[PDB]
Symmetry: C2
Subunit: 101 residues, 2 copies
Amino acid sequence: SAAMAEQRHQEWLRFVDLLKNAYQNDLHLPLLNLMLTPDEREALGTRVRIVEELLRGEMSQRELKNELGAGIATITRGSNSLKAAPVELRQWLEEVLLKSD
Amino acid sequence: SAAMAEQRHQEWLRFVDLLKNAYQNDLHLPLLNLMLTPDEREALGTRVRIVEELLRGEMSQRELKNELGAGIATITRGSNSLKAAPVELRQWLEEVLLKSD
């Protein structure tokens, strides 16, 4: 639904503002368990590792499937989205994932 | 993987602590676009509505599929997780989704 991308954008921002508010309340853990599936939480964990490793540049896409157990399409998309990422984010992720904290 | 639930729990907490940090940096929008698919962001939007409506108690499960366009299994799980939710969260969601802000 390209036609209804605006509604869908609004609906998404609602979720981000709710989570926002839960983090300031320390209710973020319960909210996240409520909103997401185990499957989804597992995936997110694994997406962190992909980005960390794409930022690292040491591993090849296939080593990445083997050592991380993430499907190739997840890697490819993870690759695409990072490039589209604003520089400011990229710098920050480097800082945190590969400068650690 | 029940056996590796602990590793998977740790990997999840990493993502929550990263997001945490992005919200305090105002880098939460870009991070979320990076980590999640359109599909996933659409779903989350839609999960908010399910919870709001389950809290409302006016609609039946099937009206819920029809007016919200969410699969029955999503509703059923959304139902199950809310019951398992800590009272403190439940109160808060009532406050926010049905007391609004």
